[PDB]
């Protein structure tokens, strides 16, 4: 079965550079057009670039021309995308895809993708704030604010509490930093007895925070 694997994605400042590689195996790489496809968060895919099996015929989308360079090493069965002068609007999941032997019109074989984030925001661990509980069901939670880039992981009591947890998708603030809440519904008869701690881990900054969430007055 055709195997494709992208690597090299990461966080980069606007104007910076990044080099993506796609490793191919279990087929005759040099006999196929290879293609780069990218998908911005919430959008459909967008064609980026084509390269012929020989490497001598190459096409680019207008939006990347003069900034991106496609190439390949047939000996190493490897496709590359050199990305210079990166822009915020280049943020997307990047996929390599196998074409046909002489054309690349649509795609059966895709890699799993590599995420490229272009932003001036600096890596930063989150501030964690309790969402204190206010009949038989009570909701409590944690506010996880001002971190960058994605992702954070949130667990409740180190993973003991899973039922009724909703960890909302992160939303990008106007500051360029992310924020989310994680909430859980619990029986109100346990608001004094049971202790509730949210464990927040932000691996891009190696930040770990635990927040005990308790009722107020």
């Amino acid at each position: 079965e055709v195997q494709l694997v992208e690597t090299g994605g990461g966080l980069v400042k606007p104007g910076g550079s990044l080099r993506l590689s796609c490793s191919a195996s279990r087929f005759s790489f040099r006999d196929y057009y290879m293609t780069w496809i990218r998908q911005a968060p919430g959008k459909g895919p967008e064609w980026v670039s084509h390269i012929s099996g020989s490497g001598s015929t190459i096409y680019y989308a207008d939006s990347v021309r003069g900034r991106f360079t496609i190439s390949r090493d047939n000996a190493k069965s490897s496709l590359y995308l050199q990305m210079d002068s990166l822009q915020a609007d280049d943020t997307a999941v990047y996929y390599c895809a196998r074409g046909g032997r002489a054309t690349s019109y649509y795609w059966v074989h895709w890699g799993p993708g590599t995420l490229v984030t272009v932003s001036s925001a600096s890596t930063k661990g989150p501030s964690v704030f309790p969402l204190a509980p206010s009949g038989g069901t009570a909701a409590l939670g944690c506010l996880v604010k001002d971190y960058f880039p994605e992702p954070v992981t949130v667990s409740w009591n180190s993973g003991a509490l899973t039922s009724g947890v909703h960890t909302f998708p992160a939303v990008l603030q106007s500051s360029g930093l992310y924020s989310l809440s994680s909430v859980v519904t619990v029986p109100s008869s346990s608001l004094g007895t049971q202790t509730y701690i949210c464990n927040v881990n932000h691996k891009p900054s190696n930040t770990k925070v635990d927040k005990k969430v308790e009722p107020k007055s």
Binding site: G100, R101, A102, T103, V108
Partner: peptide, 4 residues
């Protein structure tokens, strides 16, 4: 053919 071109598409295997």
């Amino acid at each position: 053919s071109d598409s295997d």
